[PDB]
């Protein structure tokens, strides 16, 4: 508990930026990753803005 003192203040999740990526082969495929990355919805939020 003394080492559980506030962390996420200065802590980075490090799992949100995909530096843990070695866990991505279990449930995820190749072509689904390529098409999933190609189909992104970006530029729609810019229009709605």
């Amino acid at each position: 508990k003394l080492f559980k003192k506030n962390n996420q203040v200065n802590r980075v999740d490090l799992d949100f930026l995909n530096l843990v990526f070695t866990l991505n082969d279990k449930d995820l495929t190749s072509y689904h990753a390529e098409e999933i990355s190609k189909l992104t919805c970006v530029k729609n939020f810019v229009e709605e803005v």
Partner: protein, 447 residues
């Protein structure tokens, strides 16, 4: 550019300076001089690009700082991407986890690559409406779902087993999914853009992608490049892919390797997979155990042996593991099957070009009189030495704030940092102060 931008020992060397006639240029492609050695390396370059020959070794010989390491490194750059290359050291194959024999077998396995191609038939489209009747009649009432794409929209009938399969990974429609044609596998890509405004805080699974364009079902082929080593590690374990990253192989039995060889043979017979001959380079092989030498002698004759090149600067010396002194530091059996390429020490004219071409890499402007003193000190010292002084003199000149490095700053940089030959003298005169092999040292100055 994709690699990290921090400068290395040799960052200037890119490719080899040989033309289509293989005649080397005096200064080209980042290198300088070494004409005959560069041509002898280019013969190996076309020897690899041909790919019709296997199981041969070649040696690069020379004294220290003669360009032997910048030679094999230039071969890997001209060889290009997608051609697998393995550069290790002879001291690295000594491991407590793996035996030297198997650790060397993996060193031979990683070099040769395999390209596998596979075709897929998938149905991907955004869903409009999904109807499934339950209590109206019963028993898989044949519901129908409507899949939408930008340029096409159709309605598909759903079978009983597909009714059972759609329940898992539940779909509310309003969604983009992809169904495998062969296995009927359901995959959920993610929600559309109209669903983004529903919640202020949403889970980590959610996401938004554009509707797929074109035909509903497509035929696409995918290409993969996987080395034989990765195949063997994957087949050796229930989960071997984690064993790749964790680095624990487990000393794969040689029994599985033959099965993998038969698999690759069948894949080549079917034409689905083609192999790319790779290159293996071992640096500083003057220190190696004799068991590794014999295992190299035998393992070089197999059907898949990557081309092996090595560099050793030791003269006639005792081999590690035996009392006798064999020439070159290697047994005569390894020298019997091999080809030796010798490198010669650079002259004064070439050293100044090796210097300026280095200042262009460090982006350090030099005066016309700085290369004179740095070259003069470069002749007595080793070429690998003054290259550090070209780096320090830039900072010493930076303290003086003015532009190019002046000669006086080079003299101060040489004064602050001793040469390897001077330290021997300063040690020999001060010997009583430094510790001795016998352990005797005089700490007190007072006598």
């Amino acid at each position: 550019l994709k690699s990290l931008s921090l400068i290395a020992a040799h960052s200037h060397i890119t490719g080899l300076g040989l033309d289509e006639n293989l005649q080397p240029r005096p200064t080209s492609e980042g290198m300088v001089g070494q004409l005959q050695a560069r041509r002898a390396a280019g013969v190996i370059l076309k020897m690899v690009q041909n790919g019709t020959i296997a199981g041969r070794a070649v040696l690069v010989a020379g004294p220290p700082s003669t360009g032997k390491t910048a030679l094999a490194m230039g071969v890997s750059q001209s060889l290009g991407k997608d051609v697998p290359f393995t550069a290790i050291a002879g001291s690295e194959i000594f491991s407590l986890e793996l035996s030297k024999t198997e650790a060397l077998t993996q060193a031979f396995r990683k070099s040769i690559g395999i390209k596998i191609k596979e075709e897929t038939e998938l149905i991907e489209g955004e869903v409009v409406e999904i109807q499934i009747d339950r209590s109206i009649t019963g028993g898989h009432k044949q519901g129908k779902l409507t899949i939408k794409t930008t340029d096409m929209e159709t309605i598909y009938e759903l079978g009983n087993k597909m009714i059972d399969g759609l329940t898992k990974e539940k779909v509310l429609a309003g969604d983009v999914i992809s169904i495998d044609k062969a296995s009927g596998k359901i995959t959920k890509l993610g929600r559309s853009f109209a669903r983004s405004r529903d919640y202020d805080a949403m889970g980590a699974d959610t996401r938004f992608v554009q509707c797929p364009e074109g035909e509903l079902q497509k035929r696409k082929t995918v290409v993969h490049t996987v080395s034989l080593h990765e195949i063997d590690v994957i087949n050796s374990r229930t989960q071997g892919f984690l064993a790749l990253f964790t680095g624990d192989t487990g000393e794969i039995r040689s029994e599985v390797r033959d099965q993998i060889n038969t698999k690759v043979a069948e894949w080549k017979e079917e034409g689905k997979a083609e192999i790319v001959p790779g290159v293996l380079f071992i640096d500083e092989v003057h220190m190696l155990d004799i068991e590794c030498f014999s295992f190299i002698n035998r393992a070089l004759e197999d059907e898949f042996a990557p081309i092996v090149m090595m560099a050793t600067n030791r003269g006639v010396s005792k081999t590690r593991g035996t009392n006798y002194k064999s020439p070159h530091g290697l047994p005569l059996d390894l020298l019997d099957r091999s080809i030796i390429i010798t490198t010669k020490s650079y002259n004064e004219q070439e050293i100044k070009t090796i210097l300026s071409i280095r200042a262009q890499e460090e982006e350090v402007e030099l005066s016309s009189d700085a290369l004179d003193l740095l070259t003069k000190t470069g002749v007595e010292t080793s070429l690998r030495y003054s290259s550090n002084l070209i780096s320090v003199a830039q900072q010493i000149a930076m303290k003086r704030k003015n532009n190019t490095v002046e000669v006086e700053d080079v003299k101060r940089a040489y004064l602050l940092f001793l040469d390897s030959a001077r330290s021997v003298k300063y040690v020999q005169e001060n010997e009583s102060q430094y510790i001795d092999d016998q352990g005797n040292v005089q700490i007190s100055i007072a006598k």
